[PDB]
Symmetry: D2
Subunit: 386 residues, 4 copies
Amino acid sequence: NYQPTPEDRFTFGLWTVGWQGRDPFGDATRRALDPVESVRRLAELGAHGVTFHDDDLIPFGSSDSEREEHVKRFRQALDDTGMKVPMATTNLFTHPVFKDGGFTANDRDVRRYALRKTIRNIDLAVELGAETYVAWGGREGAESGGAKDVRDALDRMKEAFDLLGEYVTSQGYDIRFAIEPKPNEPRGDILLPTVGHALAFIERLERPELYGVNPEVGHEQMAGLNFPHGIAQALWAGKLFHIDLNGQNGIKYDQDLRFGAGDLRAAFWLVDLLESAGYSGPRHFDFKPPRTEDFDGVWASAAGCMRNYLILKERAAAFRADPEVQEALRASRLDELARPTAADGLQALLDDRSAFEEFDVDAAAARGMAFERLDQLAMDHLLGAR
Amino acid sequence: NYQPTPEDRFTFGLWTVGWQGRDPFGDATRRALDPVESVRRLAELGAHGVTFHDDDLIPFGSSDSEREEHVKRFRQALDDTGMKVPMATTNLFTHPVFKDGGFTANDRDVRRYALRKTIRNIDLAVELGAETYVAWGGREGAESGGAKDVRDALDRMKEAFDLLGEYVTSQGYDIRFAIEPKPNEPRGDILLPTVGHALAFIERLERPELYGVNPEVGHEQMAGLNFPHGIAQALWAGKLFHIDLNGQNGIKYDQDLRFGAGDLRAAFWLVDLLESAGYSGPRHFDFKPPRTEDFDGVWASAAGCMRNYLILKERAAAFRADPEVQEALRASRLDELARPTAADGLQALLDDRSAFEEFDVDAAAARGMAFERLDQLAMDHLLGAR
Amino acid sequence: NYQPTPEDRFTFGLWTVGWQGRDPFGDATRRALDPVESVRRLAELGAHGVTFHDDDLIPFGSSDSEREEHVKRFRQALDDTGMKVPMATTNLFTHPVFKDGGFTANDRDVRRYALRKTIRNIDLAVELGAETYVAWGGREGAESGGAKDVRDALDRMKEAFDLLGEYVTSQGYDIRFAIEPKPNEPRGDILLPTVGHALAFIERLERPELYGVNPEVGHEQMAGLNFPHGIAQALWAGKLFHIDLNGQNGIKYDQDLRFGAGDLRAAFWLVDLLESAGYSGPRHFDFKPPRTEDFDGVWASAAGCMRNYLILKERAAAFRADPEVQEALRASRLDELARPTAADGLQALLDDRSAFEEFDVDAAAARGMAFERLDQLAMDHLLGAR
Amino acid sequence: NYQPTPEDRFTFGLWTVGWQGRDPFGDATRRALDPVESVRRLAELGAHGVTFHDDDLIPFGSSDSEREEHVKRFRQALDDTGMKVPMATTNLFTHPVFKDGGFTANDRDVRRYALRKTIRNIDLAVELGAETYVAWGGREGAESGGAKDVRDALDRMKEAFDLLGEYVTSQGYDIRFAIEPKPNEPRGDILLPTVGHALAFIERLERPELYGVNPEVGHEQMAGLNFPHGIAQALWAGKLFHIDLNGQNGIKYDQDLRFGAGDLRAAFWLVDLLESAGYSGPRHFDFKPPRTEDFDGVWASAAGCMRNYLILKERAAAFRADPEVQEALRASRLDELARPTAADGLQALLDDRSAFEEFDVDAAAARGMAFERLDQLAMDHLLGAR
Ligand SMILES: [Mg+2]
Ligand SMILES: [Mg+2]
Ligand SMILES: [Mg+2]
Ligand SMILES: [Mg+2]
Ligand SMILES: [Mg+2]
Ligand SMILES: [Mg+2]
Ligand SMILES: [Mg+2]
Ligand SMILES: [Mg+2]
């Protein structure tokens, strides 16, 4: 019955199940959770691990002794449960000092502080076993046009990521970075607003091999984009280092619904792609149990994230394995799509009369793609209506 | 009075002023224009040049003799007016053969045909003096998830662009390519949906230096993105080879309103950026006079494109030159944004107690950014209310 | 196996399966269908009936003799199959005369013509047995602010609908009107853009009882609205006279995908509502088989519309009948939602200390809504994962 | 120089300039303001008045003595400045008790409490001189489909508004209600999501004359709708009782930018309409100075709201008064739009051969609307480029 186990690599941020329910118009509806209790409850649900921002694990402004004790208790919870910490990140968005950004703040002293804060937490992430270090620059951007020269900001962003790369290399760390795009919220427009923009930016870094993307379902959907398509481009680039899974109902504030909620068919095609491509990273949920829920509803919502992934995995696998679907894929020429256009080379193509002079465009145009039959087979598989 | 002259480099597609007004629910409202008459009328308005798809200039399926005559008449119109042709492109979207794409059609024979059709028109573009060859893959994409394996499609897309690069190099042509992203329409989702995705893709081509982007105002706005920000990232990458200017009112079908219509403040910030950055390419309008208009309204709408650019240019220049604005920019630390974060280097940053151990985060947080005063100065300049 | 029969009341517009595939960037990909062949093929799939615009059934500009023959052949097809015509409508959008509207065209002569064209087709609709006459004012609206004074346009719109009401009353017809909102496309903004705006407008008509709404799934979703919620408000008002079923992937051009495609969970909640509320009107599909498809794909896509409705009907009924769901609904206080707030009356409420002076707000706030467990039961039912 | 005075009727919510800057990802960036200091500073800027939620003026949970003192100090500030309080409202969204709604909470005890809380504040609003009582049901709605039966919720909503109407009538108050639609945020979907839905709902209330709408610029724009068009429909219905002015950049979280920011041309057309129609209510700003700003930036942003209104008022008036624009309006047949379609009556229309049998559709279709010239005159007026 779609029961998750640690082998499924499901992970959750401390800040997900720990979200107290404050929104722009509302006070908290739930008490803060001790990270130790979240680690235990998530393990009981079949999670593999957790993730953290610095300030989720150690309250901002903690003394060294307080820091040591927070980490010691967390380590004990990991040891008590067998949970892992595959990813960590920095909070460069909550404190009012970051109101115009961390790495791209107009104030240079803030940019330097943001880097120091990040570096401190990279060390801790490595200590706790993380393989990936996420950077979500939620405050990088603007509400107005004069406030932020974007070329200058990208220069500062590159400078910051290059320094972080220099740092991890200098320490001999194996950890890699994953840049998380988002189009807007909390800034009017956020820099690196989509998977594409982040992929493009990485190519200008000094050591691009150290950086990939951490796409989030709802973020791409906040720009009305196709999340599976963006994931495909990230995979094509060799840059899908981590992923954030959740749900979103279209173009609006980021909802962070449990995975499977929001756009259900996009969730199906996403799981199909991740599984077909052999993505081996964490299946990480960056979601918020709605603030309508109590403590029991938090765990139900977390359980639902994993359940929905597993149902979709089953249905996508059944779709791909069905001989009738395999026939439909051939009827729609998906096999042809995967063959080179012109392995014969440019001159051969130029000399090939079947490619122009004697190409029967009308006969080709008349051939239906048979995509609707294929898609209804996909629908039938998703719904268990075969 | 904001009168354009050829020195302003304003250009228009034949298909813009020549749009007959067919939309998904409506028949044509205007007769087809002879390209010769468009060249003359645009010249009279102060345009610098025009652009074309193959099939705008030579009707699809024309004989060699018909082709020669269409080109001869067009050349005479250019010679009669002094108009230039700085850019051309291929129509890989109208004919039903392209219903699943050109370069990424599932049918291999269609992909080969698309390449041959493109190559033929590259030769003509070069003959007519074009410096840039645009590719808008409007049919590349899908309505359903099973129809298009996006990694395979990107492999085919790369194969196509690499072959085109091989071709231009083999002929010793100086022409460069500009890939035009669009998020959707006419496909449910289009591949390379934003400037970022196109920039990222280019980095995987064999000869990336031959390819840039041709962003269109309304296309990025169809994903709710900030067009000036995307242009800034393209400029930062050295990839703004051409641009398509128009207007769009938010997230909906692509409207192709005249430039300045739609998001007026985004048009202001765009012009500010293009002028500040010294963009030297064509100011090309890819727009449609609304189908409500007659022949006189077509030319009024085209004239308005250029007028609005020139008004915005004046106001943006006045904004940047105003000593009160220059003071406000310093008050908002735009000067600091342009200074390196850590030219002192990583070790110096790590050793700098002013960056962490002794950084007064509260004092920094308390410093207002003064962005609202800056933005109201920008508003006052735009509106001529200083 | 989810096989439709005429008893399910599934209907289709002639223009749906008959869509030739022209889009703003593309020529037709399919030949025109004879309405007679559509009636036969739809009947073979288990449809109950069809619908038409005037100009779908009788080519625009037909002579009286041509008109009679088109109608005679159509009547014979209905008689040969047992198909019904429960709804008809007017094409007030294709012909260039309607470029600024029908009923709200700025030109008064066009407004008068639009009314005459509509009245002629009301007579034919009644002859063919229609119970509902739809009006989709797709050209009513504007691209620019000065072009259309909306108060004046609403005065003209009211005048038109009042005249149509006067007409049907004068003829003793039983037919009722259903106004179809759409937010945009083909106009930049369309008047009466949502279900709410149309419902509000109807209340100002002289005989509001003669008018309801014909909401379309994708239209409300083009404004990012919740289609089931809008349908609920229409039902609450007693105004759901007809419905148009299709699919849409978010905020973009209207896609007109087959029903069940697009937002699958919204389709589930829609069917749940229509069935729970006992909606007894046609289940009408206003969709377009994608232009990728041939003749066989058209019929597959049409069949899929009906199949998906029937699957969703089964799953929604199972959800509502499941004792575990019934318990979850009580746990979430859906029963309380359906009880009056203050049947005791205003003075009793004012005098009730349990409602304010002695209301334990903290205890009430602490009660979780249990919505996530409820929603995961709904997901499990939809996916056949109980 | 566009200097506001109290005669312009500009008003501001206490919660606007008083916004501390908490957003979903960020802590406060500004200290709380004493309402007394806001009243004084706003008066100094030329405001006419302020507005409040109950809990802005009197901290939630205040004792009777504390309440009296808060009100006494506020009254003194009004008296010291000459400021008015034309509108007040209830906070039915911040406290966790309202997590599933106030008037449409599933819990009946919460619905009763919401009504009592509202009634208490209606009394205070009347004492302080308010003419309008706003209701923004920001928590009314759902994240998931099973959580909220919308027909039942609308029954509860009607019951609540009817009770409030009964209450004000019983007390002999002159105050009227204004329902504020919003499409989403903080709920996934909010009930009464647009002006149209709210107008439609009002028509089902027992005493509809007591209720109008309070539309907010950014709210309609969050559904991609045309705010001026919605205002026109509200005016057409006689229901524009109050308005909330701000800015919004498209479809995303509600930004609450200062008025004039966001969609500048929509702001122009809005002011044109309000002034042309003779709207006499408050010009109320419901905005948030961005959290980047300090105390000085708050007042600059507030001043900008009023300045932008006044600039736009000047330009719209100049547009309408320009004889060249008046000629263009006639050329575009705006005069015809304002004339009845068929004051001659239905039978005369049916008998009028010029309306059908002898209507030259082709000649009518050929007449351009001249909307682009009109719109460029509007652009030139807005930009001071005539
Ligand atoms: Mg998120
Ligand atoms: Mg995330
Ligand atoms: Mg375009
Ligand atoms: Mg273009
Ligand atoms: Mg449609
Ligand atoms: Mg429809
Ligand atoms: Mg707001
Ligand atoms: Mg408001």
